[model samples]
Target chain A: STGQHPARYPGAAAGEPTLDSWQEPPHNRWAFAHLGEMVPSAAVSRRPGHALARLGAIAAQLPDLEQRLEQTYTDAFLVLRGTEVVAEYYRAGFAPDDRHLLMAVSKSLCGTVVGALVDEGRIDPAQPVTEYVPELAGSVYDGPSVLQVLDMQISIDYNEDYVDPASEVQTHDRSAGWRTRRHGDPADTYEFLTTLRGDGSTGEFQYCSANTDVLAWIVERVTGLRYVEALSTYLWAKLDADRDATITVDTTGFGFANGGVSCTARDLARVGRMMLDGGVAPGGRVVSEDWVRRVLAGGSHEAMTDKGFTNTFPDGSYTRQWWCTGNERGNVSGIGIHGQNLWLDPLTDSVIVKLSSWPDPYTEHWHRLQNGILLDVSRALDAV
Target chain B: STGQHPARYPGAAAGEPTLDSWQEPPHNRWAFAHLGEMVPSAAVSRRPGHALARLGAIAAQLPDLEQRLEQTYTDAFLVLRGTEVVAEYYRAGFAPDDRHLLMAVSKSLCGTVVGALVDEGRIDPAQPVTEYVPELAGSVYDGPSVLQVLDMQISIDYNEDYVDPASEVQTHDRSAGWRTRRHGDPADTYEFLTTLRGDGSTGEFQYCSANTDVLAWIVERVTGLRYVEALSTYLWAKLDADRDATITVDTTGFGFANGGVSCTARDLARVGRMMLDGGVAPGGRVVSEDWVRRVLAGGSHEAMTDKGFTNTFPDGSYTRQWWCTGNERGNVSGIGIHGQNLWLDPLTDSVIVKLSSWPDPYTEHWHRLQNGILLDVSRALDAV
Candidate 1:
């Protein structure tokens, strides 16, 4: 209102902003996407540059899209139908090439990576977690299948709350090197995982970041590559990503593969499209169709509704790190706190990626607004 | 020797190196080229892909290049003539795409950024440091001309002893957010710069990291962009750099513009070529020929030699962040501690870039070895 850059301008967000405070409200408007500047990350390179598919015919139709993005503090948004970018939008200070942090959507990105590993026999979903990484053996993850961890059924008691600085989530941050190390904390991501005690895979939807980190570790252990390097070679290069994405790493060089990915909205859509088309890359079938099928194939709806996602999608299920909407459209989305989303809609052959910075980590109203807006946009595209 | 992946292997540099130890021997095998992991940095993007020119046919002439690289603990090396890459090599665990830390080589980079600003009439070299950055009005930098700071003539008393923990250089690191902050230290780079106090420009060669940091601050003050953003657009983007580079930043959003740049070997070579050719970037002359001319035209060799470079170069001068060989060859180079270089030899139409991890920060042996090897490579190319 005062010619000030709302979120990012100096002193615009009240007292000096920090990495921790930047995750909130007006501050998240800038910090949600620019986390790489505050942390150590490895690049996920995009290859084979060409003229990007212009978002044709939607400029006039979605007049409200820009307003919606601003109101929701969206940094970047893109709608893609079958690898073609139908529409893309970026707010001021957020450029097309700027990488917005994926937060939890990174889990979906790596989840699909697991699919490739599975197809290549590097990972067996049915095997005990220790078979791939024996060091994880005799811990809370000893008996669980790798699939169980991917499904968030490992029953890890780690909370996802961002409000409390003293929470296990903070410990995860400290352990992963995102936050400053507390005195005598676990040294790295693996050591932190060992400290986690939980029941065996209970078949209940327990969305915990630790599970995805373990999943990333499994990929690293099996492939003998850093998680970021593996993601770049395995999935990102396959997508011909438009810009180099980044995944935050802890002090020990273990990537924050749980949800630390930062990527462009267009690239996020490319990721969704790769999943929608059954893991086939420009080069070849990077992940088998069965890998994608497993993700869309939702589990029991009773357990899904009990997890309480139904408030947004009435009959959504969780599998392969995606929230599977059991509706006829067969939609699934990877959602992150502070309003980041990678939505895949197979029924319409559309994938929408929303990159946003919200005031709070999460709020029911903003969540509902984002969900409702995406469906409307899909229908508008159907009309187009 | 035994198919070992040096420095980067599990616990090779001891389990999870800290910032302090990363500067020491053996640990530096990984640390010298991987400073981004220990601190925060910003991406300096190269344009999208174009076929990188390979330096073919050097294999027969210099079969020992790789062997020498290994012996020197090199991470990556590249040689370019004009824009054509003559030869490039990467040690294991270091990729052609990896952005290796430039150590003090980052100073040369920020120096050129100042050139762009000077060319655009945004910065005046003759102006007092306080004219552009009045916040530094009363400090040690008060009356020194901006050119004095760029020439490293500023007599600010800041010790650069890497081994001494109590040095002002470490305080600069702590203030710039490179090292963990000690209690009661200046909060950010700006505050830290304000705290540095001493006599004005002494008209003698003084190589202090703090002076470059101050010069970088003047760049930031003249141009509203962050130091990282300025480097990306003004210099790197125009070079069509082969890979995105990064510069470390302090906690309060101020980038550590002095010697914090990390870039690929090829990109470093490209940077050298730009200087050699008087700043002809891909898009246009991002830097004026006058800028390159200023750098190559060194100050008094006696002044430089008296400042303690005589033992290394015999007759070398310092100007515009470059070390003027003061030879008929019209050569200049950007040198860094622990063996990083961007050596431009106009006489041979060659530019050599080397990224290394030396056991000691500075050993006459390692530095001399690198110089001799570059000369051999150049002569071989000249014969060709």
Candidate 2:
């Protein structure tokens, strides 16, 4: 199926995908779903649920939405009203079981696993992160508290820029094992963290992807399990999932917690479902009600910004690795580059998950269009 | 869990792994189970079977068998008599869904799928190898029959040496993407095949691993599906496997059919079960009985040898990518480096799967010890 979306540059000097090319343009459409075929990954095991019921026929097609979805490069779009599937659609060649890449949506899942650890009293967010991982003691992470890292308030020198080849995130990609290491790159994610230097903390919400991997490292240290294992035990195994999920791991077996999660749309919706139900899965309470309430309580809107970056949530706030929609419906969403999204509306008791392979990483125009579609779908289902 | 068996030379210049270090001792014990964490792989999807029934308590432990298993570096050992598991054991930290690397035992699986193509009349074994894959026109593969490739009689000037860094197999490893590509090497497996030239055909059987990948190429060409997809469609999906299997793929997405299948021991045994049952599965007929008979008929005894190489079956013959034991019980085997084995005895109606991470690649002494253990298990279960 990936053959349909062949790489644009067939015989380029960079024969295989680099940190940039692999996740770029036409190649990315295929790369997103078939990433495990191109990188090393750790399995997040889940209980085998029975074969999925065939999707019921669309009661009525969304007006011009069928073409609109393809234009936005949507892979799988699923809508659920309080755990009841109201609308579902999958692109050609993509199946229900296919695990589409979640990109930054992966951050929310990593944050949720951290929340689970918080619930178990194994992790204290207020403590200095160096208390958990002393290996990073002399680095930029030394003074940051676990809560500050979760809230993306760390003032590290790392840039989350996607376009610059020498940007911190791209270098981080080399350590994540997504790209071949150049001459002077860090060996793995842990080593990469120590390479970052920072000025005094301004304490403004500066999103750094490296912060998530640090949290994952803390997760591994606290639980005595690999990031993938902790994710399975704390979140994936507890969720009602049809298929097991996977996350790319670096050479040291550290999961690429910032962006490398591939899970089915419905399985991701289960995460949304858990969040909407106050951290409760069909099985039982996964994360505590306190953790869910903390996330819903929101963060410093004054600390958030739209300057120099395209902010999806202009009026909203980011807290505990989630984007608050600042809406009457009490909405919080997880957004990813290349059009991956998980929007949870508690007031309407609805969840919408969109997995796509947009040609570009992030476009404000498409993000607005996607948000509009989610709102329309929510209102339509709300009336029904 | 891999931390227990860390690499011997942590700061080696090779950094991650060359084809040599990755599959060698100390690290291999960990590498074998966690291979997907070290390389790119294509998933072979399967229908989800119910959760496995817990292994009944070992009726009684074998004589020093527990310690012997540890000495053999056994990861998982399972015995099935007439579709019923008689003896089962798993190393700590290993579980049912974990897909352990099968090494060259992967070749037999590649051959079985070829049999499926043969059954569908899509392939004629007597036809030249280039018929299905004309792209291999000017290579060592040009003159060989599909049957010759399956039986490993192609006269290619390729060595199967696992030790020599400059050996053809090692170069093949680079092409297969098992190791990083160096300067002046062929791009992928397809390119590597074309780079090989041969003298006159002696027609003597050579254990070239590339032939299996050539067969996999034919599978892809004929089916117009990726090798993993064809494998799922022709074999894995049909077998009563509890979990999906995966195979490492090259840059061109070609599966490393020689030594790259990672599957559950029970799932591997399911293939053996099908062979034992004359190409039938729990669901229905898989490969034709004719194909099974062709495999059981075996190969030329003169073509088989225990010279220059450690042979598991001295009197045995290699046919259709399987090793016929030339025993009264009519046992056939799939063997790989590092103690991976699938022993199928047709007359005894028994299948034994031994997945190990042995210290050495091949030793007559260990192979004999393993054979003795398997025979002893069969004889013990035979009377029951």
- Give candidate 1 regions above 4 Å deviation: A1-66, A119-145, A154-156, A197-201, A305-308, A380-384, B1-76, B82-97, B119-128, B134-139, B197-201, B279-282, B285-291, B306-308, B376-384
Expressed between 0 and 1, the share of native interface contacts present in candidate 1 is 0.09
**Quality class of the docking in candidate 1, CAPRI style:** incorrect
TM-scores for all candidates: the values are 0.79, 0.82
Kindly report which residue stretches of model 2 are placed more than 4 angstroms away from their true locations once superposed: A1-68, A120-122, A135-139, A282-284, A307-314, B1-71, B134-138, B282-285, B308-314
**Residue range A1-384, candidate 2, lDDT tens digits:** 001111213332322344334433334333333445554433322112222222333335356666666777677888888868877778765666677777789999999989998988999999998888887777888888999999998777887777577788778987776555788888767788877778858467888899898888898778766677777778888886787776766654457888877788888899999998989987667898888887787778887775523265556778889877676666788988867889887777889898876656666787777787776666655545
Encode model 2's per-residue lDDT on B27-97: one tens digit a residue: 43333334455654333221122222233433353556666666776777888878788777777646655
**lDDT by residue for model 1 (A36-140), tens:** 445443321211112222345565666666677677767677888775777877665445776677779889888877888988888889998888777776677
What C-alpha lDDT, on a 0 to 100 scale, does residue A154 get in candidate 2? 73
lDDT (0-100) at residue B151 of candidate 1?
84
Fnat scores for every prediction = 0.09, 0.12
Cα misplacement distance, residue B196 of candidate 2 (Å): 2.3
Candidate 1, residue B136: how far the Cα is off, in Å = 3.9
Candidate 1 chain B: worst-modelled 10 consecutive residues by lDDT: B1-10
